[PDB]
Nucleic acid binder design. Sequence first.
RNA 1: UCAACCUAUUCUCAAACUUUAAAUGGGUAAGAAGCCCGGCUCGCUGGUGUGGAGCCGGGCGUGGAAUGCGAGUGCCUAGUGG
RNA 2: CCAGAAAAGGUGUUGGUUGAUAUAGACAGCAGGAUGGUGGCCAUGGAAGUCGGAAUCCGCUAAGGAGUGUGUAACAACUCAC
RNA 3: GCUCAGGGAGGACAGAAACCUCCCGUGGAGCAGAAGGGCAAAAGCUCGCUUGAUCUUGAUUUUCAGUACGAAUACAGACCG
RNA 4: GUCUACGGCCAUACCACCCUGAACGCGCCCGAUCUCGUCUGAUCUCGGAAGCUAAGCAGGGUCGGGCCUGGUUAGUACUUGGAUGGGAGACCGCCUGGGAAUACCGGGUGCUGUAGGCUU
Lengths: 293, 48, 205, 159, 170
Amino acid sequence: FVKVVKNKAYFKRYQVKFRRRREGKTDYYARKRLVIQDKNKYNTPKYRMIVRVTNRDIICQIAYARIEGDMIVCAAYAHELPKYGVKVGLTNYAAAYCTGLLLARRLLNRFGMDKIYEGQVEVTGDEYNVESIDGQPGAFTCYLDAGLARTTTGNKVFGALKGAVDGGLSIPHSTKRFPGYDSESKEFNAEVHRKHIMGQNVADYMRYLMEEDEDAYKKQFSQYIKNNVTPDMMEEMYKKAHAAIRENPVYEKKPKREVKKKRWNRPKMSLAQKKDRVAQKKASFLRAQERAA
Amino acid sequence: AKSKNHTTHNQSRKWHRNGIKKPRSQRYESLKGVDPKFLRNMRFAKKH
Amino acid sequence: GRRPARCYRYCKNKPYPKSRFCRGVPDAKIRIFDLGRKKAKVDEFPLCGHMVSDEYEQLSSEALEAARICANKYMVKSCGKDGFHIRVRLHPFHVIRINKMLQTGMRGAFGKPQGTVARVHIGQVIMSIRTKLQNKEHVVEALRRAKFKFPGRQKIHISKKWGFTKFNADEFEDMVAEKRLIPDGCGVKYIPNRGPLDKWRALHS
Amino acid sequence: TNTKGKRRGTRYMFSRPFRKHGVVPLATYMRIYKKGDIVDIKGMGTVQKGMPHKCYHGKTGRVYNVTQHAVGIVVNKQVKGKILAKRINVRIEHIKHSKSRDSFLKRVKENDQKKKEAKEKGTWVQLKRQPAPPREAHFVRTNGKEPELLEPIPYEFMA
Amino acid sequence: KENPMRELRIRKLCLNICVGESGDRLTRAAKVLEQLTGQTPVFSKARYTVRSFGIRRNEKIAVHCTVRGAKAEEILEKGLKVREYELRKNNFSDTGNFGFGIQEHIDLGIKYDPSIGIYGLDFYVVLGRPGFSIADKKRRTGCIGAKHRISKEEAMRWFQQKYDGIILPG
RNA sequence: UCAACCUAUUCUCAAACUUUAAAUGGGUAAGAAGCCCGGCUCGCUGGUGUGGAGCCGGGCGUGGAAUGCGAGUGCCUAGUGG
RNA sequence: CCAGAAAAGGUGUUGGUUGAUAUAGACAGCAGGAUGGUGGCCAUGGAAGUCGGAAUCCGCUAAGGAGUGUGUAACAACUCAC
RNA sequence: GCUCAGGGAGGACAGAAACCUCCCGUGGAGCAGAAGGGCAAAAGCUCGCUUGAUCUUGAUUUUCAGUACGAAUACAGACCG
RNA sequence: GUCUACGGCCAUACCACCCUGAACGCGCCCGAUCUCGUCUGAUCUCGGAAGCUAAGCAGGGUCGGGCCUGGUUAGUACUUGGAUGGGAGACCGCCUGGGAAUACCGGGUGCUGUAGGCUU
Ligand SMILES: [Mg+2]
Ligand SMILES: [Mg+2]
Ligand SMILES: [Mg+2]
Ligand SMILES: [Mg+2]
Ligand SMILES: [Mg+2]
Ligand SMILES: [Mg+2]
Ligand SMILES: [Mg+2]
Ligand SMILES: [Mg+2]
Ligand SMILES: [Mg+2]
Ligand SMILES: [Mg+2]
Ligand SMILES: [Mg+2]
Ligand SMILES: [Mg+2]
């Protein structure tokens, strides 16, 4: 045979990693360099802009760390986009830009700095950086959090970054990772970045799949056909959504329904029940052995 | 001609006969070894 | 060959075992520690007598083997060749040192490994013999005549434990009949009320 | 003679405790230290930048200087017959608040609170902590049954 | 009944040719693999140095290539038409994968060429199941449970069912 | 069968082994240089008269464990270093 | 401190623990028995209870070991357990 | 971006050991060396770019008389990666 | 009742196997044109929503291993201070205070912060 490797001594000596490390959600080596404040700043908050891209959503939220747990100050999800007129295609780059913009303008609405630092009204995709206006309250700066995303060129985390930057946040960045930075020649095609923001990567592919095989087109873009969006509706829809977001970025909470108090799972049984279980198990095994023998 | 090498025998008796005096408690301690761009700030806050 | 054992008697030094640092240690000449009919069950040698030290001293590994041979040679005469089980329960680990002279003097003094010795606390079982309950005085006399090989002071105590176990003699057959401990050779295995229930089923089946 | 290394004889002193190896938890980092905080020193092996020396492990001092990652602190270190209030720069992992101060702080606020109280009453409360006094007289109720007799147990050489 | 995501499927097929020496043998052992696969293979270096085999540290001694999907199923059925759709009981791993080897490459489709020479090759079929990407995705990695993993008899019944393969006892 | 191997058991150990882990011991704290308000200044930090620090002005004594005792401070200096 | 002793022993004497047997008459002590199969099997030149290896029963019994010791070439003769 | 030492099951020649693959794997590896500490989306391994191995004034720690040198720790001003 | 995003303390949260998961999620899943990266669209990146709790994950179970917290072991081992105490010594008893750790026997099996949903 072979020695059992997950031995009782193995479980005695075994040390766990952190809970979020075991779940996989948190990179602590990146987290400590992101989130810790210099000690001569003395309880001054250090705001970070967390982007998490999901299968059906994009979570964009701004947070600073206290001891008992980091406070979220503002949030903006991709499933708030049908309020602003994006019915469908919620996990793509354009929706990432829209929710970054919504996070930015909603935070500026919370702090009362809407009419100052309005940022790029006309989307271009250049180097944009919010200069702080003297005599006014200074521009909000925060630091981009990507978590565990491989930050290569064209990432929707950098799409949400461009959304917050054009919304008016002073996030430090550079145009190496935006879609359009040509790798071999080291320049940045802002028109390509702009059509990626406005979604012509999806609309051009939609016009592509309309050509050769339309049931594959319906298999790819199903609810685009159901929600009546077409490649000539595409760019104007995102521009109307940008105008709607920059017009009214405040967020309502849904009124809470009164609970029925229904226990949807199975609660933890006491020690009396699980001692009685094995008592009648031993009684059952003995009374089933004595007759079968 | 060997010798006794190291000892700490009569040393504690020699210390306490004048006493191990604790350092001089004094308010307004100095500002040497403080962060110099903090102390620039402090000196401009004093001069204005 | 070796110097008298009144020299290396008291537990003076720190326990200095045969290890990575002390190398070249000559082997302690006791190497058989238990013998007799050591291949036996627990049911057939209940009685057990312990030679218990009563001094904090060092017993040499040569005196251990001398006393083992003296306690074996009596019971092969007395109890027959398979009617007992000696277990010496002090393995020697403390290696002792020797500064031998040939003229340098005392300068540069740290001994070479000479022998191995066993440091024995107050009230500790040196040797223990299990046999039938009818061979009680044979254990007493065997341990008595094996006392004279050791230095110091030893008493002889016949325990209340069933053989080489940690369970009492008035409770051993009770707990066997209750199936709370099961034989596996020289000793027993204690079954708690804590395992998974299939191990309960497998012993009650 | 002994070597005079910076880290001689600290194989258990800066060692991490059992099953507490690995990543430093971040609430050590997220705790702000202002000027004049009474604060303890306990070096950590996982980080090596800003190690306080092994004569300061377990000493309590007072913060005088705060930098980005580290803290200056005046600790009392005893040199053969005297005690120097000397100042050292310690990185933020190796240092932790003293709870020997906040019990005094809450006692100051507590007895100034009850000195503001009972001032309009005229009630004179006691504020100096007296030591644990001798126990006063009290009836022990032998309710019913008698005290149980104890005897020295007879000797049996159980070994 | 049946739940269609525990339907058993292949997830990769790995080829190698370990020529055991570098140079013109090995660089054509790669050229036969790109004839098989339509993609460039990768030279594996030697991990240690054993003078008995004639290899040294970091010598290019083997060439390997992994294939997925329909091209993998094509190369698999070519090799099984070589091996007569018949394998053995011992050819199957405990974890559920299997594999075998072919003694010369001219049988499974490759025209014999004198500049290439002759080369034997290995298959290894890594059977998957929809859900085995949990083990190697980056963000929330986890093990894949106990019901879901492949036994050995599930691989045996998969091979006896999919291709009507003959498992001989041995 | 003899062995290695594997699984629960068992006898005996460590200055340069260790999960646990004392006694004696080592820091710090036991208020007026402390608290509690109001207002300035700053070229540092800053979503924010945010943060921190320094200044002015005011109010608080039941002097905040026990015991004991005057304390601080500076020159010059012999002998000693088996 | 500190100026001298141990293992081991003693039917000297004094305490103490534990277990036996004893008016169904013990411990001594003086007397009477101490038998048969049988000179039990292996062996050995000879071993008859008595140098050796394993067994170790029965009968008659108030009671006697296939023998505790002295003896013998081997017996005999004596002695002991009972 | 990866995960090590080792082990189990497999795969033409191939074996005890060459290469491919699956699974277990709290470190049993590696970090130039002596040992000790420390380390797992790293301090290890592999890639890309590099010269913070640079210019400069103070403070502090270590040995210590509370002196040097060596070594190291916080800062600060430049130029940079 | 519960989940997601980010957390705090880091096993009362780990590990193995089994059972159940309404809704919203989180996932698995379908693809490779574009951004991106590989031998390989497996991973990473990008575009989706045909299918599905099978797995991840969540809740629960195991006279479960572990871990955590108590009892016993134990006023035992060790120990501050003391004696013109014993003992040839080794070491031991006492006075004054402090006081552990296995084996063995119980009990527990994540709490919680900020933000947003679901149970209309
Ligand atoms: Mg990172
Ligand atoms: Mg001298
Ligand atoms: Mg002599
Ligand atoms: Mg010595
Ligand atoms: Mg890294
Ligand atoms: Mg390095
Ligand atoms: Mg895919
Ligand atoms: Mg599932
Ligand atoms: Mg399920
Ligand atoms: Mg358990
Ligand atoms: Mg919660
Ligand atoms: Mg209803």
